Enzyme design. Structure first.
Site, PDB file in Angstrom:
ATOM      1  N   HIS A 135       9.491 -10.568  55.823  1.00 56.19           N
ATOM      2  CA  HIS A 135       8.240 -10.263  55.093  1.00 56.19           C
ATOM      3  C   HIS A 135       7.000 -10.076  55.946  1.00 56.19           C
ATOM      4  CE1 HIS A 135      10.324 -11.052  51.415  1.00 56.19           C
ATOM      5  NE2 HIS A 135      10.532 -12.342  51.696  1.00 56.19           N
ATOM      6  N   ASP A 168      19.848  -5.753  54.539  1.00 61.17           N
ATOM      7  CA  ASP A 168      19.209  -6.983  54.131  1.00 61.17           C
ATOM      8  C   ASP A 168      19.858  -7.569  52.870  1.00 61.17           C
ATOM      9  OD1 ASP A 168      17.198  -8.805  52.970  1.00 61.17           O
ATOM     10  OD2 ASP A 168      15.689  -7.892  54.274  1.00 61.17           O
ATOM     11  N   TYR A 216      15.265   7.617  53.872  1.00 63.98           N
ATOM     12  CA  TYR A 216      15.668   6.649  54.902  1.00 63.98           C
ATOM     13  C   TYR A 216      15.298   5.194  54.544  1.00 63.98           C
ATOM     14  CZ  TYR A 216      17.005  10.792  57.535  1.00 63.98           C
ATOM     15  OH  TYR A 216      17.611  11.946  57.940  1.00 63.98           O
TER      16      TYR A 216
HETATM   17  O1  LIG Z   1      12.989 -16.351  50.953  1.00 61.67           O
HETATM   18  C1  LIG Z   1      11.992 -15.655  51.106  1.00 61.67           C
HETATM   19  C2  LIG Z   1      10.601 -16.163  50.815  1.00 61.67           C
HETATM   20  C3  LIG Z   1      10.382 -16.602  49.344  1.00 61.67           C
HETATM   21  C4  LIG Z   1       8.875 -16.865  49.171  1.00 61.67           C
HETATM   22  C5  LIG Z   1       8.553 -17.262  47.717  1.00 61.67           C
HETATM   23  C6  LIG Z   1       7.033 -17.483  47.609  1.00 61.67           C
HETATM   24  C7  LIG Z   1       6.664 -18.289  46.351  1.00 61.67           C
HETATM   25  C8  LIG Z   1       6.914 -19.768  46.522  1.00 61.67           C
HETATM   26  O2  LIG Z   1       7.897 -20.238  45.979  1.00 61.67           O
HETATM   27  N1  LIG Z   1       6.033 -20.515  47.261  1.00 61.67           N
HETATM   28  C9  LIG Z   1       6.018 -21.913  47.506  1.00 61.67           C
HETATM   29  C10 LIG Z   1       6.784 -22.837  46.778  1.00 61.67           C
HETATM   30  C11 LIG Z   1       6.653 -24.205  47.014  1.00 61.67           C
HETATM   31  C12 LIG Z   1       5.754 -24.670  47.974  1.00 61.67           C
HETATM   32  C13 LIG Z   1       4.972 -23.765  48.686  1.00 61.67           C
HETATM   33  C14 LIG Z   1       5.085 -22.403  48.433  1.00 61.67           C
HETATM   34  N2  LIG Z   1      12.142 -14.395  51.561  1.00 61.67           N
HETATM   35  O3  LIG Z   1      13.423 -13.898  51.854  1.00 61.67           O
HETATM   36 CA   LIG Z   2      17.482  -8.208  50.501  1.00 57.42          CA
HETATM   37 NA    NA Z   3      12.890   4.370  57.443  1.00 60.12          NA
HETATM   38 ZN   LIG Z   4      14.633 -14.744  50.570  1.00 63.34          ZN
END
Ligand SMILES: O=C(CCCCCCC(=O)Nc1ccccc1)NO
Ligand SMILES: [Ca+2]
Ligand code: NA
Ligand SMILES: [Zn+2]
Length: 368
Positions: A135, A168, A216
């Site tokens: 991300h 991914d 792509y």
């Molecule tokens: O796994 C991920 C990231 C997931 C991020 C989700 C963000 C929302 C969230 O649950 N935040 C959070 C929860 C508990 C404490 C602090 C932040 N990407 O692959």
């Molecule tokens: Ca994915």
């Molecule tokens: Na691309």
């Molecule tokens: Zn994830």
């Protein structure tokens, strides 16, 4: 045949702490390591400690301003950086914690070192379970990711590879990676993810790339409760078509374990075998492969998943009965490597799966 695997791990990784209540636990990487050591997998692969990636390495993608902020920000000086924190999206999902920059440097160092090793033709596979933080953007942290080790590793691969395929399997859309390479045909991004009122909100099947990058970027949006049978129904056919049409010379596979059944944040229903079938499918193409970590919030299942996927990378069969290890109690009440799916409803009908696949096939027909 069987392949040479180089694996990256720093023993300090498990000590980085996001804070009380935060689901991202770097300790799961240490649990993974200790479990695979106890299975004897170190006898079959080279184990490397990655270097701490420098600002010169990170700024091959990230802006000078964002990296300077990450290098400077600490819990003791936080109060003096309130504005800078909001600008770079640091403070809630992406907290300031002791050793934050060093955690980024080690996560990145494994991915970049693995890419260099593949470029030098010194390994067939490189593994970095501390990486896969898909991300992070040029000047912004997001979804527990601060430095995009994947983008940096792909930029490294692009020095020797005309076309790089990114896949991914994390439950969340690989937005940061898709964004960095959205306008280029030199990297094809393929993300399978839960889509619809779910983080990060992107990855519609209609998001296909722009300019030279049109066709792509590939997104397979999914609903709650996908299982091994349904995932397996589409993964091999899509990857096979991608390989046929795109003809990449290197692959990067993000293995986010939050797509497993019983994940604390996830809503999918894959088993470790279902997840690992993805690695087996990518492995058959015999291309230089960089395997990365990602999400995964039920830590016992993350350790099982990545231990099994390392054994899969090595073509080494391992028993279902877990060997004793430093975290043996986390694997109760069963003390087995493989997991059972839950009774959750699979909202992805077989018709839905086939229809999205047919729509993606139409897009793949548009490649040269
Ligand atoms: O796994 C991920 C990231 C997931 C991020 C989700 C963000 C929302 C969230 O649950 N935040 C959070 C929860 C508990 C404490 C602090 C932040 N990407 O692959
Ligand atoms: Ca994915
Ligand atoms: Na691309
Ligand atoms: Zn994830």
């Amino acid at each position: 045949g069987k392949k040479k695997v180089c694996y990256y791990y720093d023993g300090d990784i498990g000590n980085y702490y996001y804070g009380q209540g935060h689901p991202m636990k770097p300790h799961r990487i240490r649990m993974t390591h200790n479990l695979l050591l106890n299975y004897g997998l170190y006898r079959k692969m080279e184990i490397y400690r990655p270097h701490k990636a420098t600002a010169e390495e990170m700024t091959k993608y990230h802006s000078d301003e964002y990296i300077k902020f990450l290098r400077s920000i600490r819990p003791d000086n936080m109060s003096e950086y309130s504005k800078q924190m909001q600008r770079f999206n640091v403070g809630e999902d992406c907290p300031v914690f002791d050793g934050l920059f060093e955690f980024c440097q080690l996560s990145t160092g494994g991915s970049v070192a693995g890419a260099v090793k593949l470029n030098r033709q010194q390994t067939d596979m490189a593994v970095n379970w501390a990486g896969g933080l898909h991300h992070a953007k040029k000047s912004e942290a997001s979804g527990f990711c601060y430095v995009n080790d994947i983008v940096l590793a792909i930029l490294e691969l692009l020095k020797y590879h005309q076309r790089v395929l990114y896949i991914d399997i994390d439950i969340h859309h690989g937005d940061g990676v898709e964004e960095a390479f959205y306008t280029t045909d030199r990297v094809m991004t393929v993300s399978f993810h839960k889509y619809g009122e779910y983080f990060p909100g992107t990855g519609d099947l209609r998001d296909i790339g722009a300019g030279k990058g049109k066709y792509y970027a590939v997104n397979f949006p999914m609903r709650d409760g996908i299982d091994d049978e349904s995932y397996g129904q589409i993964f091999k056919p899509i990857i096979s078509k991608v390989m046929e049409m795109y003809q990449p010379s290197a692959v990067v596979l993000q293995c986010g374990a939050d797509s497993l059944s019983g994940d604390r944040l996830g809503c999918f229903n894959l088993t470790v075998k279902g997840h690992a079938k993805c690695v087996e499918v990518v492995k058959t193409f015999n291309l230089p492969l960089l395997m990365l970590g990602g999400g995964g919030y039920t830590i016992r299942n993350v350790a099982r998943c990545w231990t099994y996927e390392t054994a899969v990378a090595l073509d080494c069969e391992i028993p279902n009965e877990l060997p004793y290890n430093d975290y043996f109690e986390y694997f109760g009440p069963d003390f087995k490597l493989h997991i059972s799916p839950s009774n959750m409803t699979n909202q992805n009908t077989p018709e839905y799966m086939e229809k999205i696949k047919q729509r993606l096939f139409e897009n793949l027909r548009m490649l040269p």
